[PDB]
Each structure stands twice: as structure tokens, then as C-alpha cells.
PDB file of all heavy atoms in Angstrom:
ATOM      1  N   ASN K   1       0.808  -1.231   0.000  1.00  0.00           N
ATOM      2  CA  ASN K   1       0.000   0.000   0.000  1.00  0.00           C
ATOM      3  C   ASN K   1       0.831   1.268   0.000  1.00  0.00           C
ATOM      4  O   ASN K   1       0.590   2.190   0.797  1.00  0.00           O
ATOM      5  CB  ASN K   1      -0.969  -0.007   1.178  1.00  0.00           C
ATOM      6  CG  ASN K   1      -2.011  -1.085   1.046  1.00  0.00           C
ATOM      7  OD1 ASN K   1      -2.473  -1.382  -0.063  1.00  0.00           O
ATOM      8  ND2 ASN K   1      -2.387  -1.688   2.173  1.00  0.00           N
ATOM      9  N   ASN K   2       1.828   1.290  -0.882  1.00  0.00           N
ATOM     10  CA  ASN K   2       2.718   2.437  -1.040  1.00  0.00           C
ATOM     11  C   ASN K   2       3.606   2.795   0.149  1.00  0.00           C
ATOM     12  O   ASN K   2       4.213   3.871   0.161  1.00  0.00           O
ATOM     13  CB  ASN K   2       1.942   3.670  -1.561  1.00  0.00           C
ATOM     14  CG  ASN K   2       1.429   3.462  -2.960  1.00  0.00           C
ATOM     15  OD1 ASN K   2       0.215   3.494  -3.212  1.00  0.00           O
ATOM     16  ND2 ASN K   2       2.352   3.204  -3.889  1.00  0.00           N
ATOM     17  N   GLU K   3       3.692   1.879   1.117  1.00  0.00           N
ATOM     18  CA  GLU K   3       4.550   1.997   2.295  1.00  0.00           C
ATOM     19  C   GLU K   3       5.543   0.806   2.339  1.00  0.00           C
ATOM     20  O   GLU K   3       5.145  -0.348   2.182  1.00  0.00           O
ATOM     21  CB  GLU K   3       3.690   1.994   3.573  1.00  0.00           C
ATOM     22  CG  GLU K   3       3.672   0.619   4.292  1.00  0.00           C
ATOM     23  CD  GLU K   3       2.396   0.278   5.056  1.00  0.00           C
ATOM     24  OE1 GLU K   3       1.390  -0.179   4.421  1.00  0.00           O
ATOM     25  OE2 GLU K   3       2.434   0.417   6.316  1.00  0.00           O
ATOM     26  N   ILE K   4       6.818   1.104   2.574  1.00  0.00           N
ATOM     27  CA  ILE K   4       7.829   0.066   2.848  1.00  0.00           C
ATOM     28  C   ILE K   4       7.557  -0.597   4.200  1.00  0.00           C
ATOM     29  O   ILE K   4       7.549   0.060   5.247  1.00  0.00           O
ATOM     30  CB  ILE K   4       9.264   0.646   2.852  1.00  0.00           C
ATOM     31  CG1 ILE K   4       9.542   1.361   1.531  1.00  0.00           C
ATOM     32  CG2 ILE K   4      10.300  -0.457   3.170  1.00  0.00           C
ATOM     33  CD1 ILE K   4      10.780   2.166   1.517  1.00  0.00           C
ATOM     34  N   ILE K   5       7.323  -1.900   4.170  1.00  0.00           N
ATOM     35  CA  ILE K   5       7.171  -2.649   5.424  1.00  0.00           C
ATOM     36  C   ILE K   5       8.473  -3.312   5.983  1.00  0.00           C
ATOM     37  O   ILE K   5       8.508  -3.751   7.113  1.00  0.00           O
ATOM     38  CB  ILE K   5       6.029  -3.647   5.346  1.00  0.00           C
ATOM     39  CG1 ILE K   5       6.325  -4.753   4.358  1.00  0.00           C
ATOM     40  CG2 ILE K   5       4.697  -2.925   4.999  1.00  0.00           C
ATOM     41  CD1 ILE K   5       5.186  -5.755   4.246  1.00  0.00           C
ATOM     42  N   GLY K   6       9.540  -3.337   5.199  1.00  0.00           N
ATOM     43  CA  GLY K   6      10.786  -3.906   5.671  1.00  0.00           C
ATOM     44  C   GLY K   6      11.692  -4.172   4.500  1.00  0.00           C
ATOM     45  O   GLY K   6      11.272  -4.013   3.355  1.00  0.00           O
ATOM     46  N   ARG K   7      12.938  -4.528   4.795  1.00  0.00           N
ATOM     47  CA  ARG K   7      13.932  -4.836   3.752  1.00  0.00           C
ATOM     48  C   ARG K   7      14.508  -6.252   3.905  1.00  0.00           C
ATOM     49  O   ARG K   7      14.891  -6.651   4.996  1.00  0.00           O
ATOM     50  CB  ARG K   7      15.067  -3.792   3.776  1.00  0.00           C
ATOM     51  CG  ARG K   7      16.217  -4.025   2.805  1.00  0.00           C
ATOM     52  CD  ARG K   7      17.086  -2.791   2.689  1.00  0.00           C
ATOM     53  NE  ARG K   7      16.431  -1.768   1.858  1.00  0.00           N
ATOM     54  CZ  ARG K   7      17.075  -0.820   1.164  1.00  0.00           C
ATOM     55  NH1 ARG K   7      18.400  -0.731   1.188  1.00  0.00           N
ATOM     56  NH2 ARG K   7      16.398   0.056   0.439  1.00  0.00           N
ATOM     57  N   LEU K   8      14.566  -7.002   2.800  1.00  0.00           N
ATOM     58  CA  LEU K   8      15.256  -8.296   2.790  1.00  0.00           C
ATOM     59  C   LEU K   8      16.677  -8.101   2.310  1.00  0.00           C
ATOM     60  O   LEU K   8      16.910  -7.323   1.405  1.00  0.00           O
ATOM     61  CB  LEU K   8      14.528  -9.281   1.864  1.00  0.00           C
ATOM     62  CG  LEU K   8      13.049  -9.565   2.153  1.00  0.00           C
ATOM     63  CD1 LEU K   8      12.541 -10.569   1.064  1.00  0.00           C
ATOM     64  CD2 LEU K   8      12.812 -10.113   3.562  1.00  0.00           C
ATOM     65  N   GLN K   9      17.622  -8.770   2.956  1.00  0.00           N
ATOM     66  CA  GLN K   9      19.023  -8.765   2.580  1.00  0.00           C
ATOM     67  C   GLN K   9      19.351 -10.202   2.293  1.00  0.00           C
ATOM     68  O   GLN K   9      19.114 -11.070   3.122  1.00  0.00           O
ATOM     69  CB  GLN K   9      19.858  -8.291   3.763  1.00  0.00           C
ATOM     70  CG  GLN K   9      19.663  -6.776   4.128  1.00  0.00           C
ATOM     71  CD  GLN K   9      20.498  -6.434   5.324  1.00  0.00           C
ATOM     72  OE1 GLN K   9      20.219  -6.915   6.413  1.00  0.00           O
ATOM     73  NE2 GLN K   9      21.544  -5.633   5.137  1.00  0.00           N
ATOM     74  N   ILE K  10      19.874 -10.460   1.104  1.00  0.00           N
ATOM     75  CA  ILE K  10      19.991 -11.831   0.618  1.00  0.00           C
ATOM     76  C   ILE K  10      21.420 -12.088   0.164  1.00  0.00           C
ATOM     77  O   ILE K  10      21.982 -11.297  -0.595  1.00  0.00           O
ATOM     78  CB  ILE K  10      19.016 -12.062  -0.582  1.00  0.00           C
ATOM     79  CG1 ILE K  10      17.548 -11.961  -0.135  1.00  0.00           C
ATOM     80  CG2 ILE K  10      19.240 -13.454  -1.250  1.00  0.00           C
ATOM     81  CD1 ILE K  10      16.582 -11.719  -1.293  1.00  0.00           C
ATOM     82  N   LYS K  11      22.005 -13.179   0.652  1.00  0.00           N
ATOM     83  CA  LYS K  11      23.299 -13.634   0.172  1.00  0.00           C
ATOM     84  C   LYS K  11      23.116 -14.789  -0.828  1.00  0.00           C
ATOM     85  O   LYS K  11      22.472 -15.766  -0.506  1.00  0.00           O
ATOM     86  CB  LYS K  11      24.120 -14.154   1.358  1.00  0.00           C
ATOM     87  CG  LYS K  11      25.540 -14.576   0.969  1.00  0.00           C
ATOM     88  CD  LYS K  11      26.348 -14.977   2.242  1.00  0.00           C
ATOM     89  CE  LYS K  11      26.384 -16.435   2.566  1.00  0.00           C
ATOM     90  NZ  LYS K  11      27.684 -16.812   3.266  1.00  0.00           N
ATOM     91  N   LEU K  12      23.714 -14.665  -2.009  1.00  0.00           N
ATOM     92  CA  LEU K  12      23.557 -15.657  -3.060  1.00  0.00           C
ATOM     93  C   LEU K  12      24.758 -16.597  -3.120  1.00  0.00           C
ATOM     94  O   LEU K  12      25.863 -16.266  -2.642  1.00  0.00           O
ATOM     95  CB  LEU K  12      23.322 -14.982  -4.422  1.00  0.00           C
ATOM     96  CG  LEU K  12      21.957 -14.266  -4.365  1.00  0.00           C
ATOM     97  CD1 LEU K  12      22.186 -12.752  -4.370  1.00  0.00           C
ATOM     98  CD2 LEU K  12      21.088 -14.651  -5.475  1.00  0.00           C
ATOM     99  N   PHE K  13      24.527 -17.777  -3.684  1.00  0.00           N
ATOM    100  CA  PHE K  13      25.556 -18.817  -3.748  1.00  0.00           C
ATOM    101  C   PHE K  13      25.801 -19.021  -5.238  1.00  0.00           C
ATOM    102  O   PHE K  13      25.127 -19.818  -5.863  1.00  0.00           O
ATOM    103  CB  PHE K  13      25.109 -20.135  -3.098  1.00  0.00           C
ATOM    104  CG  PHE K  13      24.369 -19.992  -1.757  1.00  0.00           C
ATOM    105  CD1 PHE K  13      23.198 -20.697  -1.534  1.00  0.00           C
ATOM    106  CD2 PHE K  13      24.868 -19.192  -0.720  1.00  0.00           C
ATOM    107  CE1 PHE K  13      22.524 -20.620  -0.339  1.00  0.00           C
ATOM    108  CE2 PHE K  13      24.190 -19.094   0.490  1.00  0.00           C
ATOM    109  CZ  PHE K  13      23.007 -19.808   0.679  1.00  0.00           C
ATOM    110  N   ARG K  14      26.718 -18.254  -5.817  1.00  0.00           N
ATOM    111  CA  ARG K  14      26.921 -18.292  -7.261  1.00  0.00           C
ATOM    112  C   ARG K  14      27.297 -19.708  -7.694  1.00  0.00           C
ATOM    113  O   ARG K  14      26.903 -20.103  -8.787  1.00  0.00           O
ATOM    114  CB  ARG K  14      27.980 -17.285  -7.712  1.00  0.00           C
ATOM    115  CG  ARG K  14      28.010 -17.035  -9.225  1.00  0.00           C
ATOM    116  CD  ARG K  14      29.286 -16.282  -9.625  1.00  0.00           C
ATOM    117  NE  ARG K  14      29.226 -15.829 -11.015  1.00  0.00           N
ATOM    118  CZ  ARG K  14      29.787 -16.470 -12.045  1.00  0.00           C
ATOM    119  NH1 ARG K  14      30.438 -17.595 -11.836  1.00  0.00           N
ATOM    120  NH2 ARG K  14      29.672 -15.995 -13.285  1.00  0.00           N
ATOM    121  N   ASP K  15      27.998 -20.468  -6.823  1.00  0.00           N
ATOM    122  CA  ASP K  15      28.366 -21.896  -7.086  1.00  0.00           C
ATOM    123  C   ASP K  15      27.195 -22.893  -7.124  1.00  0.00           C
ATOM    124  O   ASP K  15      27.377 -24.076  -7.414  1.00  0.00           O
ATOM    125  CB  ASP K  15      29.486 -22.441  -6.154  1.00  0.00           C
ATOM    126  CG  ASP K  15      29.105 -22.499  -4.657  1.00  0.00           C
ATOM    127  OD1 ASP K  15      27.949 -22.780  -4.253  1.00  0.00           O
ATOM    128  OD2 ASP K  15      30.035 -22.304  -3.837  1.00  0.00           O
ATOM    129  N   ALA K  16      26.000 -22.419  -6.820  1.00  0.00           N
ATOM    130  CA  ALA K  16      24.821 -23.254  -6.910  1.00  0.00           C
ATOM    131  C   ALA K  16      24.360 -23.335  -8.368  1.00  0.00           C
ATOM    132  O   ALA K  16      23.868 -24.377  -8.806  1.00  0.00           O
ATOM    133  CB  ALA K  16      23.699 -22.684  -6.012  1.00  0.00           C
ATOM    134  N   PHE K  17      24.509 -22.235  -9.101  1.00  0.00           N
ATOM    135  CA  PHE K  17      23.823 -22.026 -10.371  1.00  0.00           C
ATOM    136  C   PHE K  17      24.286 -20.713 -10.944  1.00  0.00           C
ATOM    137  O   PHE K  17      23.556 -19.706 -10.852  1.00  0.00           O
ATOM    138  CB  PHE K  17      22.293 -21.937 -10.117  1.00  0.00           C
ATOM    139  CG  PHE K  17      21.431 -21.973 -11.348  1.00  0.00           C
ATOM    140  CD1 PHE K  17      20.019 -22.004 -11.201  1.00  0.00           C
ATOM    141  CD2 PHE K  17      21.976 -21.958 -12.639  1.00  0.00           C
ATOM    142  CE1 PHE K  17      19.183 -22.027 -12.316  1.00  0.00           C
ATOM    143  CE2 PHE K  17      21.153 -21.973 -13.766  1.00  0.00           C
ATOM    144  CZ  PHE K  17      19.742 -22.021 -13.608  1.00  0.00           C
ATOM    145  N   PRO K  18      25.489 -20.680 -11.559  1.00  0.00           N
ATOM    146  CA  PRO K  18      26.004 -19.413 -12.046  1.00  0.00           C
ATOM    147  C   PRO K  18      25.103 -18.522 -12.896  1.00  0.00           C
ATOM    148  O   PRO K  18      25.000 -17.317 -12.633  1.00  0.00           O
ATOM    149  CB  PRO K  18      27.270 -19.836 -12.819  1.00  0.00           C
ATOM    150  CG  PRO K  18      27.754 -21.002 -12.081  1.00  0.00           C
ATOM    151  CD  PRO K  18      26.481 -21.769 -11.755  1.00  0.00           C
ATOM    152  N   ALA K  19      24.470 -19.073 -13.931  1.00  0.00           N
ATOM    153  CA  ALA K  19      23.662 -18.230 -14.820  1.00  0.00           C
ATOM    154  C   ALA K  19      22.379 -17.711 -14.137  1.00  0.00           C
ATOM    155  O   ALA K  19      21.922 -16.630 -14.435  1.00  0.00           O
ATOM    156  CB  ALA K  19      23.277 -19.019 -16.122  1.00  0.00           C
ATOM    157  N   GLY K  20      21.804 -18.514 -13.255  1.00  0.00           N
ATOM    158  CA  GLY K  20      20.568 -18.123 -12.553  1.00  0.00           C
ATOM    159  C   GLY K  20      20.824 -17.084 -11.472  1.00  0.00           C
ATOM    160  O   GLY K  20      20.019 -16.180 -11.280  1.00  0.00           O
ATOM    161  N   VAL K  21      21.942 -17.231 -10.774  1.00  0.00           N
ATOM    162  CA  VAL K  21      22.457 -16.223  -9.811  1.00  0.00           C
ATOM    163  C   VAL K  21      22.785 -14.888 -10.487  1.00  0.00           C
ATOM    164  O   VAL K  21      22.368 -13.814 -10.007  1.00  0.00           O
ATOM    165  CB  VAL K  21      23.660 -16.789  -9.022  1.00  0.00           C
ATOM    166  CG1 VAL K  21      24.390 -15.669  -8.212  1.00  0.00           C
ATOM    167  CG2 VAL K  21      23.166 -17.870  -8.106  1.00  0.00           C
ATOM    168  N   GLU K  22      23.518 -14.934 -11.602  1.00  0.00           N
ATOM    169  CA  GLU K  22      23.830 -13.692 -12.312  1.00  0.00           C
ATOM    170  C   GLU K  22      22.596 -12.971 -12.837  1.00  0.00           C
ATOM    171  O   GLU K  22      22.505 -11.751 -12.744  1.00  0.00           O
ATOM    172  CB  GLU K  22      24.908 -13.891 -13.421  1.00  0.00           C
ATOM    173  CG  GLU K  22      26.287 -14.264 -12.877  1.00  0.00           C
ATOM    174  CD  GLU K  22      26.946 -13.200 -11.958  1.00  0.00           C
ATOM    175  OE1 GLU K  22      26.677 -11.983 -12.079  1.00  0.00           O
ATOM    176  OE2 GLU K  22      27.761 -13.611 -11.106  1.00  0.00           O
ATOM    177  N   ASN K  23      21.619 -13.726 -13.345  1.00  0.00           N
ATOM    178  CA  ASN K  23      20.381 -13.102 -13.778  1.00  0.00           C
ATOM    179  C   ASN K  23      19.677 -12.440 -12.588  1.00  0.00           C
ATOM    180  O   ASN K  23      19.240 -11.316 -12.690  1.00  0.00           O
ATOM    181  CB  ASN K  23      19.455 -14.143 -14.429  1.00  0.00           C
ATOM    182  CG  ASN K  23      18.166 -13.534 -14.975  1.00  0.00           C
ATOM    183  OD1 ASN K  23      18.193 -12.548 -15.732  1.00  0.00           O
ATOM    184  ND2 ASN K  23      17.020 -14.136 -14.608  1.00  0.00           N
ATOM    185  N   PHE K  24      19.595 -13.141 -11.460  1.00  0.00           N
ATOM    186  CA  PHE K  24      18.989 -12.561 -10.255  1.00  0.00           C
ATOM    187  C   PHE K  24      19.703 -11.277  -9.843  1.00  0.00           C
ATOM    188  O   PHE K  24      19.066 -10.232  -9.691  1.00  0.00           O
ATOM    189  CB  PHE K  24      18.969 -13.559  -9.094  1.00  0.00           C
ATOM    190  CG  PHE K  24      18.166 -13.074  -7.902  1.00  0.00           C
ATOM    191  CD1 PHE K  24      16.800 -13.358  -7.801  1.00  0.00           C
ATOM    192  CD2 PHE K  24      18.777 -12.324  -6.880  1.00  0.00           C
ATOM    193  CE1 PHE K  24      16.039 -12.895  -6.719  1.00  0.00           C
ATOM    194  CE2 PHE K  24      18.023 -11.854  -5.782  1.00  0.00           C
ATOM    195  CZ  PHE K  24      16.661 -12.151  -5.695  1.00  0.00           C
ATOM    196  N   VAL K  25      21.025 -11.347  -9.671  1.00  0.00           N
ATOM    197  CA  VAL K  25      21.789 -10.152  -9.287  1.00  0.00           C
ATOM    198  C   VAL K  25      21.671  -8.985 -10.284  1.00  0.00           C
ATOM    199  O   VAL K  25      21.517  -7.832  -9.871  1.00  0.00           O
ATOM    200  CB  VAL K  25      23.296 -10.481  -8.970  1.00  0.00           C
ATOM    201  CG1 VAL K  25      24.056  -9.232  -8.607  1.00  0.00           C
ATOM    202  CG2 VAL K  25      23.427 -11.465  -7.843  1.00  0.00           C
ATOM    203  N   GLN K  26      21.730  -9.252 -11.598  1.00  0.00           N
ATOM    204  CA  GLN K  26      21.656  -8.121 -12.536  1.00  0.00           C
ATOM    205  C   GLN K  26      20.283  -7.506 -12.611  1.00  0.00           C
ATOM    206  O   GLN K  26      20.141  -6.335 -12.941  1.00  0.00           O
ATOM    207  CB  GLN K  26      22.151  -8.497 -13.939  1.00  0.00           C
ATOM    208  CG  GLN K  26      23.566  -9.023 -13.969  1.00  0.00           C
ATOM    209  CD  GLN K  26      24.574  -8.110 -13.277  1.00  0.00           C
ATOM    210  OE1 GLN K  26      24.449  -6.881 -13.290  1.00  0.00           O
ATOM    211  NE2 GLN K  26      25.596  -8.717 -12.687  1.00  0.00           N
TER     212      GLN K  26
END
């Protein structure tokens, strides 16, 4: 409803899935 309720901070594991991680990050 146009208000920030919180922030997620996420650490990615590029060694899990390089192309899928890079797409997420970009």
C-alpha cells in the first residue's frame, strides 16, 4: 500500500547455479 514494510538482505551462492544467480543479481 505504497509503504515500505521492511527490507530483505539476501546472500547468493553463485556456485549453486552461475547463470541463474547472475540473472537474479543483474
Side-chain angles (χ1 to χ4, degrees):
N1 294 324
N2 294 119
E3 101 211 81
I4 304 169
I5 67 181
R7 176 167 284 206
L8 303 179
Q9 291 178 292
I10 294 161
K11 184 175 96 149
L12 294 110
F13 317 133
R14 194 193 190 262
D15 64 36
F17 191 175
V21 169
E22 294 298 332
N23 183 51
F24 189 90
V25 179
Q26 303 308 327

